[PDB]
Amino acid sequence: ARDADTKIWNGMVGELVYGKADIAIAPLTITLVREEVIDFSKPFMSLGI
């Protein structure tokens, strides 16, 4: 997730935001706050809380 007041995305987000990692095939959830910094394909498996 992002940091408060500095927007530092850690974790698997910042690996793609900050140019570290090239692609991420992983259980990652399409949100609203993630489309602004990275892009997602069409979803391949559905779920819920």
């Binding site: 394909s41 069409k42 391949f44 498996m45």
Partner: protein
């Protein structure tokens, strides 16, 4: 974007999901939920009588 739709079209996602969730039915109720035992009456059943 064009690649994941091929796997959705040709059921490869279904095959992988079956392999990694349904072929490894291990614990209890999934396997033994459709079997039958006849009976043997013990005293714990009939006590209030």
């Amino acid at each position: 974007n064009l690649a994941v739709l091929k796997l959705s079209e040709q059921g490869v996602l279904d095959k992988l999901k079956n392999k990694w969730w349904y072929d490894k039915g291990e614990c209890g109720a999934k396997d033994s939920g459709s079997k039958e035992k006849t009976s043997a009456l013990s005293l714990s059943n009939v006590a209030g009588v």
